[PDB]
Paper text:
To provide a foundation for fungus-specific inhibitor development, we determined the crystal structure of the clinically relevant C. neoformans var. grubii IMPDH in complex with the substrate IMP and the inhibitor MPA. CnImd1 forms a tetramer and in the final model each monomer contains 395 of the 544 residues in the typical eight-stranded α/β barrel structure, plus one molecule each of IMP and MPA bound in the active site, consistent with our functional observations suggesting an uncompetitive mechanism of enzyme inhibition. The large accessory subdomain between residues 130–244 and residues 438–449 from the mobile flap have no interpretable electron density, common to previous structural studies on this class of enzymes. MPA makes far fewer interactions in the cryptococcal IMPDH:IMP:MPA complex than observed in the hamster IMPDH structure, perhaps accounting for some of the differences in Ki between the mammalian and fungal enzyme. In particular, T347 (Cryptococcus numbering) faces away from the active site in the Cryptococcus enzyme and does not bind MPA, while several other residues including N317, D288 and G340 participate in fewer interactions with the ligands in the cryptococcal complex. Of note, one of the two residues responsible for MPA resistance in C. gattii VGIV IMPDH, R336 (K336 in the resistant enzyme), forms direct contacts with only IMP in the cryptococcal complex, suggesting a possible mechanistic explanation for the failure of the R336K single mutant to exhibit any altered sensitivity to MPA. The change in orientation of the loop in CnImd1 creates a large, Cryptococcus-specific pocket in the active site. The cryptococcal IMPDH structure is unique in having most of the mobile flap, except for 12 residues that encompass a small insertion region unique to Cryptococcus, sufficiently ordered to permit all but three residues corresponding to the flap in human IMPDH to be observed.
Numbering used by the authors:
A (entry chain A), B (entry chain A), C (entry chain A), D (entry chain A): 4 to 129, 245 to 437, 450 to 525
């Protein structure tokens, strides 16, 4: 028998009974999210490996809510976080993105004093109705990243003093005793500063950080545009499967998940959210913008900015597959210093003032096509099997 | 045991018993259409992902009937519809294609008056024995596209007055309350003008439009040659699976299906029909022809015409993967204006007078190779499992 | 439980018991031929899609017999047939290949008189111990191709008179009433001239031609190096699956199978034979050689010969993916004339006197690596599951 | 029901119970090694086809032991063996690699006297705490390769006299009666010189060599960077599946396995070991280094060294896919001489003194990410299912 359709009728059916006959089918058209994200059946999937199937439209795209949670206590009007990278997020980006309803995560490749001064400028900043404002203060929300070394405790204290709302524990692999203990330390020292723990790609890693007290999870290992060629990497996970697996588990505890790495367009954003992510983090997509740090320069007629991985030799010196313009494939500088990312340049993207509304509109249109009015409904329909998917072959 | 063959004989079998032994096999060679088009087993398929297996020939290719239904009331001698695009279909293309036994769908990127004047020229037009003539009038058949906004009701009235036979409701996603209500409006206002509803890629979407009163379904979402790179798209479906899934359902109600987008050669046409489509719609294949609108121009020694998506910035301004000659990858012009297609150019293809007979002959030869004499038999054999298929890997 | 291995031992096993423990495994390492060639499990496979796993060597490569049957009555020392193509086989190639133990199939893109004169030169021809000699006459074996039109009956009579040993019924799809009736005609007129029928890619097609009285089967549809891009083709089959499926059935009746098309190297030959083919047919591999017809010419410093498909506009005028040097992508010349292949050029390959011994030696070495001493043993081990295979992914 | 997750809870779960809920899951996230390396389910896999999933970190990377066994009696601090190739290993490389904790295998493309003189220089050689020293002598360990022809018996005697610790039986296919008998000959003549037998890619081949008395297995057939394009090869196996299949069996007898061929970066090393290999062999990665044999020369501005396969026409004359700088695709020189590899050049890599510590550090970091402290634990976790994997699609 046909497992995808009921037996064919003997004679033509009445078109007015089409909706009744649709209910006789053994399963929905395409795949459920649970069927798509099966490691044994389909392997590890990236965003480009599948599509979301269209649903029913009964609302304009302007009615779509993109409201989501970055952490268990932080609600954002736009599910966009800028990456804590020295060529992506400083105070200018953190302010601009917050004004558009997103959230900036200021990098830590500077002294704790310089970082605290950047956090302070975001918090003190004074047309933008979607603005990410802290409810009782009306100040813009501010995030920042730190490592999990003993000296990071003192760094966080200066950041807390500067008015920090949320902290990102910056790591290629957050499932360590060092990060687990550091989370517990923040939960006891600063209970009001939300903790985004990671990076994680497995359910087992997520469970450790959820139990430690993480308020949000940063998902991704090897997915970044400036990440060393994956043919050179041994440990990681394809981003789609990573986003699904972690959020499938984390959502049971109400812990929002941030899809970090490999977001190159609106489609990637829609797909990451459709997989269970509550928000996305962008490095590459926000690099080369006016609000990003670093100077513009010309490279063979093109106006560019440097965009680099934080594990690149250049970023580590205290001063790679999918990528825009150019890049250099470095591997080592010191035998002890193993490069984990690349340094290159990205073309001028203009201001985020024009770019972020484009991403916002495009995402409302994508959710409308899927028949979805909110991120909450997107997730609910993904878990129920109402929201359908289809794998795409090479061609 | 071997599920594909019976046990091997102890000694050689007699070649005169080959046909008797063939009936001992547990299944036919290759795959049935139902086995090929399994989302869980094979993922989403495009035309290039499979082949049709050859059958038995007992007729010349000239005996193959390519007669099919564009809608439940319109019978065409050639299953070819030209796309409603400003660089594909105006009156010249609608007349020429109709004379060859096909059907032209005039675009709506003009005033309702200009569009009605184009429809009128097709209807008034007065060597071509395959000609798509309306039975009781002997005039050439004419199709036209419209949107589903309130002002489109008035547009259709001017088109109806001009002698319009069939209307295409022009949309990237036709499963909306706006289109469903617009179909019901046409069925009550103009019961004699056939409605082609869409675009649709799922069985669930098809059911809504069939129940509303659609006379034909336009299938495709993201398959078009001028469609924005699918790595940028979030919602859609691979064309083969879309064509199969929709026609598997629609054929139960006698609603013909039009395979729209990604037809680049005869093989694509044969495969779309073999999947269950009653006809194909061509944009790219018919662009650059003498009968298509727009002027010829030279681009670095090559005689070309512009070919563009209707969702391109250039088409929207009221004046991308698989593609001929050149293209530009636009994404936005206005933050509110999100590009859904690209504008490029296509090489001179000559007249359709030489081109359409080539497509017709080639398609008769393809059906002959499969052992098929008509579109009706092609479908019957596809559903029975007599017509076989084979998936093709990357190599 | 693990379906590929028995439970792991509690403590280390004795290395002297390795052969005893090997027999405790639930299945052989890798895949059986029946497991590899499963359409539902693996799709349609080409030669590049898999490898043959190595076996046990207990003989030198020089002990490998490459003796096989081209037809049920013709035994060849070398399983190589040259293709009946106007740029591959005339009398010079037919003589040279026969002297090396193979078999030439003279083309029919000439008058029946010219073709009969070429057959006669092979038969009259008078260092080469592997020579394909007819047993009771000591003359070189000669093959020739014909179509299945009424005028081909008279062509075959002139060829029979010239001393023809074997006839190839030349067709892109041999499963027709025209070929079936033509086979019966030859079996009754010339019972002593072996018939190679085809081309075929399915078990169902093979059964028809076996029942008609074919002495050998020519396998391939769309596999040829000069064959129109498969993205343009609708009907055919990946060569590996075609070779397997047809020979799995044909071998039950003792009908040898010729793997025709897509042989570009020794590995392809070994794989075609390992799949069940009794011999291979080469067009591309034998084009550009001294013995092939047509003049050498220079093309931008390179010494070349034309190599073209018999369905190309140039071959049809009575005078495309995998290919050497250059090619032109023609599609039509006359609306009635649909191109089925391409015309291009191939680099000078030298004489077959140096080339054929290279292919012979290489093939002995391949069979030795698989632990196989003869074509008969290769087939026996392929059917028993002793000969193992492995699918290869893209990387 | 969902086979990958338990039913979803009715209301939110407590994050402090995350570790308890994790134990309710029907299976671990991702795949077990046994699930990944299933030929019927996933086909033949190379290193690039999968990733290792991250585990739990509770130690610094500097605490990772890379100590492993090259043979049943030889313990190495670094699991690196240099390939016995005339452009990779002579005395300089054997000494340098041994000093870094690895093991050099001196080539045999020289007289037995010259080879014995190279072995002697390694053994007589007199800052390096990881040094591969023979326990009772304090001399550096030395390996060497030989063939299995009668004259190789006399070659080994001169090598034994020179102080040889381990012998590699050099072959593209070691499962022969010639190698099996040669192993037994060494076991009886020189019981104290460890035998590395191969090359092997199947469990059936491994069983023969284990039963003969091999102390280690050299795994690989067609995986080498200088190996003739695999589209030309008929017999072999994808490296990942080869490494897994052989080590799954060999580990039951305590016979270490050497992953030989296709190691181009640290990730490949980590993956080969994670699959069950006890060590890796490098040709390409160690060619172009100061310690490798052959002179540096300039090729269009680049400082290079020749790197060639031992089956290349140039290496055989007693004087190809994945590859650095350049290469030539030779196939034959003499009709009897069939090329099995290519000759090309590789860019200057500098000294191994800087390169080997880079590889060592990188590998400690990879094992740390997987939550693994030693090679022994890596294997134990791979067999238990604690160490997880994920397949990677093309994108
Ligand atoms: C910390 O920044 C990252 C992140 C977030 C990720 C990756 C990565 O390589 C680096 C650079 C790694 C550096 C700076 C070394 C320190 C470390 O390893 O923590 C990645 O692979 O997944 C996510
Ligand atoms: C309407 O024209 C199409 C069609 C038929 C399709 C697609 C598409 O993008 C456009 C352009 C979209 C435009 C003009 C915006 C309006 C809208 O969205 O209806 C496609 O993806 O599937 C089919
Ligand atoms: C006859 O020569 C071939 C053969 C053997 C094959 C193919 C093919 O296209 C042609 C050219 C087709 C021509 C000359 C037209 C006549 C016909 O169709 O018989 C192929 O696809 O599979 C095998
Ligand atoms: C012996 O060196 C190798 C090895 C180790 C391998 C291959 C190979 O081709 C050669 C060259 C083959 C030559 C010198 C001919 C002799 C022979 O065949 O033994 C390979 O494919 O897997 C591993
Ligand atoms: O050097 C690096 N190597 C690997 N990943 C990095 C590195 N630097 C930053 N990342 C990660 O990649 C992300 C950015 O990815 P992108 O948006 O694809 O450009 C960051 O948020 C980090 O998770
Ligand atoms: O701008 C666009 N974006 C995506 N699809 C479009 C656009 N314009 C037209 N289409 C669709 O693509 C089809 C043409 O596809 P083509 O024959 O592959 O060139 C049309 O019939 C429409 O369905
Ligand atoms: O024009 C053509 N189109 C498709 N196949 C052809 C044509 N001409 C010859 N062939 C076939 O392809 C074979 C040669 O393939 P080759 O060895 O790959 O070059 C012939 O033996 C025929 O089966
Ligand atoms: O000529 C050859 N053909 C195929 N493989 C070879 C040849 N020469 C050496 N090899 C093998 O390939 C290995 C080197 O692989 P590499 O590290 O990928 O460059 C050697 O250790 C051998 O197993």
């Amino acid at each position: 028998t046909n497992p995808n359709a009921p037996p064919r009728p003997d004679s033509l059916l009445n078109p007015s009974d089409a909706l009744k006959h649709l209910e006789e089918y053994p399963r929905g058209d395409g795949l459920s999210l649970q069927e798509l994200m099966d490691s044994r059946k389909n392997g590890g999937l990236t965003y480009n490996d599948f599509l979301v199937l269209p649903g029913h439209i009964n609302f304009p795209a302007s009615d779509v809510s993109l409201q989501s949670k970055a952490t268990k206590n932080i609600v954002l009007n736009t599910p966009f976080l800028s990456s804590p990278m020295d060529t992506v997020t400083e105070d200018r980006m953190a302010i601009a993105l917050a004004l558009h309803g997103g959230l900036g995560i200021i990098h830590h490749n500077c002294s704790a004093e310089e970082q605290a001064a950047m956090v302070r400028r975001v918090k003190k900043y004074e047309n933008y109705p979607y603005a990410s404002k802290v409810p009782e203060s009306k100040q813009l929300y501010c995030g920042a990243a730190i490592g999990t070394r003993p000296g990071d405790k003192d760094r966080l204290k200066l950041l807390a003093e500067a008015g920090l709302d949320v902290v990102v524990l910056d790591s290629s692999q957050g499932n360590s005793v060092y990060q687990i203990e550091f989370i517990k330390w923040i939960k006891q020292t600063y209970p009001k500063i939300d903790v985004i723990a990671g990076n994680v790609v497995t359910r087992e890693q997520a469970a450790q950080l959820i139990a430690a007290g993480a308020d949000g999870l940063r998902i991704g290992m090897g997915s970044g545009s400036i990440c060393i060629t994956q043919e050179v990497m041994a440990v990681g996970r394809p981003q789609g499967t990573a986003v699904y697996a972690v959020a499938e588990f984390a959502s049971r505890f109400g812990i929002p998940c941030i899809a970090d790495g490999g977001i190159g367009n609106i489609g990637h954003i829609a797909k990451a959210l459709a997989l269970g992510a509550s928000a996305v983090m962008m490095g590459g997509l926000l690099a080369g913008t006016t609000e990003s740090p670093g100077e513009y320069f010309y490279h063979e007629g093109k106006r560019v900015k440097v965009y680099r991985g934080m594990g690149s030799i250049e970023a580590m010196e205290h001063t790679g597959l999918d990528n825009a313009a150019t890049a250099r494939y470095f591997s080592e500088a010191d035998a002890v210093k193993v490069a984990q990312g690349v340094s290159g340049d990205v073309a001028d993207k203009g201001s985020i003032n024009k770019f972020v509304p484009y991403l916002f509109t495009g995402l409302q249109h994508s959710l409308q096509d899927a028949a979805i009015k909110s991120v909450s409904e997107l997730h609910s329909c993904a878990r129920s099997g109402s929201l359908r998917f289809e794998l795409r072959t090479a061609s």
